[PDB]
Amino acid sequence: KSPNVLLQNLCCRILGRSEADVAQQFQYAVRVIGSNFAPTVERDEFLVAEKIKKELIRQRREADAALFSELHRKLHSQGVLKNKWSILYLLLSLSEDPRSYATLFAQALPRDAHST
Amino acid sequence: SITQLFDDLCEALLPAANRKRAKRSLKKVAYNALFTNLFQLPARNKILMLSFDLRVGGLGPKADRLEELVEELEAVGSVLDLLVQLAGSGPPRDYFLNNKHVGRNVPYSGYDCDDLSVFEMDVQSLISREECLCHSMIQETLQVMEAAPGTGLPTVGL
Amino acid sequence: NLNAVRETMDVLLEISRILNTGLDMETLSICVRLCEQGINPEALSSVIKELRKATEALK
Amino acid sequence: AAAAAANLNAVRETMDVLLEISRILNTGLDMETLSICVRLCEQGINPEALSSVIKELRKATEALK
Amino acid sequence: IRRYTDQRSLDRSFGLVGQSFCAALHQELREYYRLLSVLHSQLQLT
């Protein structure tokens, strides 16, 4: 569709409320998503594969990392996606325990050496 | 009457310089289009949906002002409902963004070279506009200086 | 109330300018008086555009 | 046609591999929410910005629960 | 300024406040090099 109504659909998805019952959260949503309608960094899909590995070893859930090692191949094998960085980076960002430091670990390419 | 205010709508949107037969035909045009829709979500949410595309196109404080005014107009509902339907078919320094020389305890971020470069573009659009005026003033008159004589003047029709 | 409806008329102007509507001050006054009767505004949006087309039909 | 169904099949397979990747991390998101989040990133969007609303709204569906 | 930073980390008697002073004499070189990098990107200037 169009992005602005799609964000309202997200707001009605997470909250149980409808779109004619909440307007401050959608206002906060247009505040935060706005002027960030694209990645502000450069994509490194290899590193974000390595970050799911570096996360699942850190949890000592080492078998599901080797399971992800085959699911990433399936991702390449199908190839209906041209944004594999965005969803996987987002899924890593929303990280929840099934049940340290990253200030020395490498971060996404910031474009501070290139005029944006 | 309400059908008389539609004559005043025809009066504002057509000035006078004939001019007594055009206004009744425009009055017909005002009446004939009103009743085709009548035979066949909140209000401020659409304002947020239009502020979003502003923020997508940059220009932060304009979206921050558009949201500022509807917040205090809710702190006349049917007239902004007309403006969202008339949108986009009408006519349309500062030293505290990339100048860190003024302020009180200015924010420390190192330096800038990535918005200071889009501080020249802020002037470059003006420099590209005020040359398009002089392109459109030399064109309207070279359309007069060069032609076969009297095809822009009705004096040959006298 | 006469204090309030001049200030709300003035704030009503800015959101008609920045939404890029065809209205200026005069047509804004005509339209605020027209909506005060009770007309649906989604209908008014078509008659204003048809007037602005048939005005250009003459010139 | 057949290629008009082959594409709609070809994205369902990927969406379920993504759903497996979604459930082995066991994020609290489901398929319906995931259908919005996939559509948003095809038009382009900052993942650090969508994570901000989702990390706000999941703690806001408990203060208003 | 770079001459000084190159010597105060060559001194372990300049102090535990000297290795605090020198911390904003590393940032003050790092941001300079960042600026030379951005200048390099727009070369392909007056």
Side-chain angles (χ1 to χ4, degrees):
Chain A
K1 283 190 72 186
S2 90
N4 42 26
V5 60
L6 205 43
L7 316 170
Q8 195 187 238
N9 300 338
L10 250 190
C11 168
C12 308
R13 280 314 296 138
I14 302 175
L15 210 55
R17 303 279 75 78
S18 158
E19 69 273 16
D21 201 11
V22 54
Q24 183 61 254
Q25 265 57 74
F26 191 39
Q27 189 171 212
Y28 179 78
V30 64
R31 166 198 186 181
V32 292
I33 300 295
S35 50
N36 292 102
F37 196 57
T40 79
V41 284
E42 293 176 75
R43 62 179 307 164
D44 188 3
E45 40 187 297
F46 177 57
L47 174 65
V48 303
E50 299 325 284
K51 282 169 162 168
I52 298 171
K53 292 202 195 69
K54 270 36 145 198
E55 175 187 60
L56 282 177
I57 301 302
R58 185 171 51 191
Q59 286 183 333
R60 296 187 187 274
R61 212 170 305 278
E62 320 196 47
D64 297 343
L67 163 62
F68 177 73
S69 72
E70 304 156 300
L71 303 161
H72 201 195
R73 188 263 307 156
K74 290 188 185 63
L75 260 296
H76 290 199
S77 316
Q78 275 79 84
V80 302
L81 191 41
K82 309 325 299 165
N83 281 257
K84 304 186 192 288
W85 178 87
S86 57
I87 294 305
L88 277 298
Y89 195 43
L90 179 59
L91 177 50
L92 186 79
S93 69
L94 297 173
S95 288
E96 176 182 300
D97 197 6
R99 190 165 303 221
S100 178
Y101 67 101
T103 79
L104 310 172
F105 275 121
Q107 306 296 319
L109 196 39
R111 313 167 73 198
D112 47 0
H114 185 88
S115 313
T116 52
Chain B
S1 187
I2 298 107
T3 174
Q4 295 177 357
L5 308 176
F6 283 105
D7 209 21
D8 313 336
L9 284 149
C10 302
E11 184 66 25
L13 261 174
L14 194 65
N18 196 36
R19 272 304 307 121
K20 66 178 69 65
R21 295 173 56 152
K23 45 170 181 164
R24 169 62 212 183
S25 87
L26 290 194
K27 180 152 61 175
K28 283 166 67 184
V29 172
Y31 298 155
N32 290 359
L34 163 67
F35 305 92
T36 172
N37 63 273
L38 292 182
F39 282 148
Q40 300 175 64
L41 189 72
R44 72 176 291 158
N45 279 354
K46 317 185 64 171
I47 301 298
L48 304 161
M49 291 177 181
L50 290 170
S51 318
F52 183 71
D53 300 326
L54 302 173
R55 291 165 204 260
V56 169
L59 53 94
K62 177 40 57 200
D64 305 322
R65 181 78 160 176
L66 173 57
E67 282 186 30
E68 191 174 309
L69 258 57
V70 58
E71 192 73 87
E72 69 173 339
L73 203 50
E74 205 167 86
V76 78
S78 191
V79 68
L80 188 44
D81 277 11
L82 186 49
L83 304 176
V84 293
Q85 295 300 300
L86 296 170
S89 89
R93 312 193 173 179
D94 200 355
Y95 304 103
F96 293 83
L97 174 70
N98 309 316
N99 265 25
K100 299 150 173 179
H101 315 300
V102 303
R104 191 184 285 180
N105 321 115
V106 290
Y108 167 74
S109 80
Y111 304 102
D112 197 13
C113 186
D114 279 355
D115 199 297
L116 196 54
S117 199
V118 79
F119 196 52
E120 315 184 276
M121 309 285 108
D122 190 27
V123 187
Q124 188 56 244
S125 58
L126 191 64
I127 297 181
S128 314
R129 274 185 271 118
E130 303 302 280
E131 302 299 304
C132 286
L133 303 177
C134 80
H135 300 335
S136 45
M137 289 151 189
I138 197 170
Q139 179 164 179
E140 67 170 86
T141 317
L142 266 295
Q143 272 169 229
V144 192
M145 292 298 287
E146 171 163 39
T151 49
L153 296 184
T155 183
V156 168
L158 276 75
Chain C
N1 185 247
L2 76 167
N3 54 296
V5 307
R6 191 180 58 163
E7 322 316 294
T8 200
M9 183 62 145
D10 197 18
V11 66
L12 201 53
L13 185 52
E14 193 185 312
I15 61 180
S16 48
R17 178 58 49 154
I18 67 177
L19 272 176
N20 200 1
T21 73
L23 310 186
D24 52 297
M25 277 61 83
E26 287 77 358
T27 68
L28 178 62
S29 164
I30 309 289
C31 88
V32 298
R33 196 162 55 256
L34 188 48
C35 301
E36 162 189 74
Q37 308 305 309
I39 304 296
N40 191 61
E42 276 82 30
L44 304 165
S45 324
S46 88
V47 299
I48 297 173
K49 293 177 179 184
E50 288 316 299
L51 206 180
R52 285 192 299 166
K53 186 64 183 76
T55 280
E56 302 178 5
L58 295 170
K59 317 182 291 190
Chain D
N7 305 340
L8 201 78
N9 183 223
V11 286
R12 176 72 270 171
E13 54 200 21
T14 306
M15 192 57 153
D16 286 341
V17 182
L18 263 303
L19 188 56
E20 189 57 57
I21 300 176
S22 82
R23 78 155 302 275
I24 61 173
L25 178 42
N26 203 7
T27 46
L29 166 138
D30 49 22
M31 158 72 191
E32 295 179 352
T33 35
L34 186 45
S35 59
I36 315 281
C37 308
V38 180
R39 275 192 306 212
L40 280 164
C41 84
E42 305 303 282
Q43 297 175 131
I45 191 153
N46 192 25
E48 297 176 352
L50 303 106
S51 200
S52 60
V53 266
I54 299 169
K55 288 180 304 180
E56 189 60 57
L57 286 185
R58 291 187 301 197
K59 69 188 189 274
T61 185
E62 301 199 288
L64 310 168
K65 182 148 191 174
Chain E
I1 190 201
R2 191 184 177 274
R3 191 267 303 163
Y4 190 62
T5 296
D6 288 353
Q7 300 161 154
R8 296 307 97 193
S9 43
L10 288 186
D11 193 11
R12 310 304 195 109
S13 191
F14 184 49
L16 187 56
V17 314
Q19 308 187 2
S20 330
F21 192 53
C22 197
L25 315 173
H26 309 308
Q27 303 173 274
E28 306 296 302
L29 297 171
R30 285 187 275 182
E31 278 303 310
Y32 200 99
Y33 307 143
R34 186 249 176 189
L35 264 287
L36 302 186
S37 280
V38 188
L39 260 55
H40 197 95
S41 52
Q42 287 180 275
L43 161 72
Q44 302 186 66
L45 201 56
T46 305

